[PDB]
Structure 1
Amino acid sequence: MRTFFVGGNWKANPKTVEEAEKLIEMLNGAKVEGNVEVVVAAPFAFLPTLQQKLRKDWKVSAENVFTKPNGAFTGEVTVPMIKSFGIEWTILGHSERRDILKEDDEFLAAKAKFALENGMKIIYCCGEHLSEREAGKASEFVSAQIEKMIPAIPAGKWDDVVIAYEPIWAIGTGKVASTQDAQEMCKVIRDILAAKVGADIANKVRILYGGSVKPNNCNELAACPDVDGFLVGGASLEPGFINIVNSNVHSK
């Protein structure tokens, strides 16, 4: 059985380092049940304090990295800088970066390859927008994203890759995703992997649900067979985050 995986994506929150520290202290007191791999992703400026203060059985993640080790890239943070603090993870391809900062698949594949070849682990995000959902072309769209990601992954590095599905069609559109939607799309992804890189890799890669996950749905979601965990949004800043970590006991 793949180890259940929960990443808390703080996104661009909280506003202050003091709030970040308060949040860390709460996470540090949380009683985790079952077996689960927990990763906490935070704004670059809070990464040193999170790496310093966060419980050592959890790991810290960046929310992005650039494509190069260093250089003439004002404003960008790079893998070596992250690693210098002992941080081992980054998110890549989040819908907010693809949409608002205009990150394209070519840029993202270059980041996945560079990250992995430099010893990072990645949470690689994908997912379709409203029109493709309506057209019944979700699988196709998600497939093309995964097919762009596949060639990026170096030999021997699938152990260091986690994929998160984001129902972007359910974000601010007036439409909501169901538990079955999550299961269907995670299965879609696993089957793409199986066809393209083989069953052994498909069976080991954790595929996460990255839509709205809260204490009131995490248990039903976790129980879905192809849902291996979550990339949590707003609840990662709240006490309910622990409920979501602990939903691993409902997944088999």
Structure 2
Amino acid sequence: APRKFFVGGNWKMNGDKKSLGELIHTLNGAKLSADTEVVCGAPSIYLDFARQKLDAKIGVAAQNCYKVPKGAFTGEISPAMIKDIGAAWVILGHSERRHVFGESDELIGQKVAHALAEGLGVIACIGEKLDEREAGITEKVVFEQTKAIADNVKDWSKVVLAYEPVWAIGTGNPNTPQQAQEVHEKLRGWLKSHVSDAVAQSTRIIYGGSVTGGNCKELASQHDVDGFLVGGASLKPEFVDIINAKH
């Protein structure tokens, strides 16, 4: 019944085998709350290494993939490859894919369709730019983004919605608990009106954007914040405190 608390650790473009080995070793040894679903997004070049070294009970997420299993797409990786090395997650639509690398909603949606059909779980990311927030269209944008994802999700049981407002990522400027709750509440409302009651109640909507061990307790306690997408802090020992946000 109650949604399992979920924290994903997006390492982004960071680390080598030495430092990621140390990061994993610390994680493998830490007292983690059994309640928490943990997944680590490793750089593609280290995904295989990450899955070998990480405890099986911690999942491994690719930081992106493409929308068919193979083809002339130099630089891309496909879900089949991600499954091939034993990872079971991909992060899709991350703020950086949309706004640094120009990945459209149509492309993200296709990626979501493909990854789910290949048996991966997806952390689908959404979020509005600061200018969109002050223009008043936060809802309009995240809903549009959520819909483009939702149009390609038959089974929500393996999707985690991740709300990361662009102006909070890497900035040390996180949503207050109140702000995150507000947007999460509205997304869950979206799911309830556009998909189903069950999917709204069962789907995890995690908060990303400058989450730390110091601010995570209070973000986690909000009714509709089901966990965290963590970037900068996911490279640090305080990722453990974040996994343990509730406890």
Q: Same fold (TM over 0.5)?
A: yes
Q: Does the Cα contact within 8 Å between 2:10 and 2:42 map onto a contact in 1?
A: yes
Q: Deviation digits for residues 26-67 of structure 1, max 9, x if unmatched? A: 111110125110001110111111111101211111000001
Give the structure-2-normalised TM-score. 0.96
Q: Distance in 1 between matches of 2:38 and 2:170?
A: 27
Q: CA deviation at 1:20?
A: 1.1
Q: CA deviation at 1:170?
A: 3.2
Query: Structure 1 stretches (4+) deviating beyond 4 angstroms?
Result: 171-176
Q: Deviation digits for residues 84-140 of structure 1, max 9, x if unmatched? A: 111110000000010111100000000000010110100000010011111221111
Which residue among 212, 225, 228 is the counterpart of 2:226? 228
Match of 1:27 in 2: 27
Match of 1:186 in 2: 184
Paired AA for residue 70 in structure 2:
N
Match of 2:134 in 1: 134
Give the structure-1-normalised TM-score. 0.94
Q: CA deviation at 1:165?
A: 0.3
Match of 1:90 in 2: 90
Q: CA deviation at 1:169?
A: 2.9
Q: Distance in 2 between matches of 1:76 and 1:209?
A: 27
Report 1:1-252 matches (<5 A). Answer: 1-14=2-15, 16-154=16-154, 157-171=155-169, 176-249=174-247
Q: Distance in 2 between matches of 1:112 and 1:221?
A: 27
Residue segments in structure 2 that go unaligned for 5+ positions in a row: none
- 2:161 is paired with a residue whose SS is strand
Q: Does the Cα contact within 8 Å between 1:23 and 1:237 map onto a contact in 2?
A: yes
Q: Distance in 2 between matches of 1:131 and 1:172?
A: 17
Query: Identical aligned pairs, as a percentage?
Result: 48
Q: Does the Cα contact within 8 Å between 2:170 and 2:210 map onto a contact in 1?
A: no
Q: CA deviation at 1:75?
A: 1.1
Identify if the C-alpha distance between structure 1 residues 175 and 5 changes in structure 2 by more than 3 Å, giving closer, same or farther.
closer
Q: Distance in 2 between matches of 1:171 and 1:20?
A: 22
Q: Distance in 1 between matches of 2:133 and 2:171?
A: 12
Q: Distance in 2 between matches of 1:175 and 1:237?
A: 18
- 1:159 is paired with a residue whose SS is helix
Identify if the C-alpha distance between structure 1 residues 176 and 43 changes in structure 2 by more than 3 Å, giving closer, same or farther.
closer
Residue segments in structure 1 that go unaligned for 5+ positions in a row: none
Task: Give the alignment's Cα RMSD to 1 decimal.
Answer: 1.4
* Count of residue pairs brought into register by the alignment: 246
Q: Distance in 1 between matches of 2:11 and 2:244?
A: 18
Q: CA deviation at 1:242?
A: 0.3
Paired AA for residue 31 in structure 1:
K
Q: Does the Cα contact within 8 Å between 2:176 and 2:219 map onto a contact in 1?
A: no
Paired AA for residue 4 in structure 1:
F
Q: CA deviation at 1:177?
A: 2.5
Q: Does the Cα contact within 8 Å between 1:210 and 1:230 map onto a contact in 2?
A: yes
Paired AA for residue 44 in structure 1:
S
Identify if the C-alpha distance between structure 1 residues 24 and 172 changes in structure 2 by more than 3 Å, giving closer, same or farther.
closer
Q: Distance in 2 between matches of 1:44 and 1:34?
A: 27
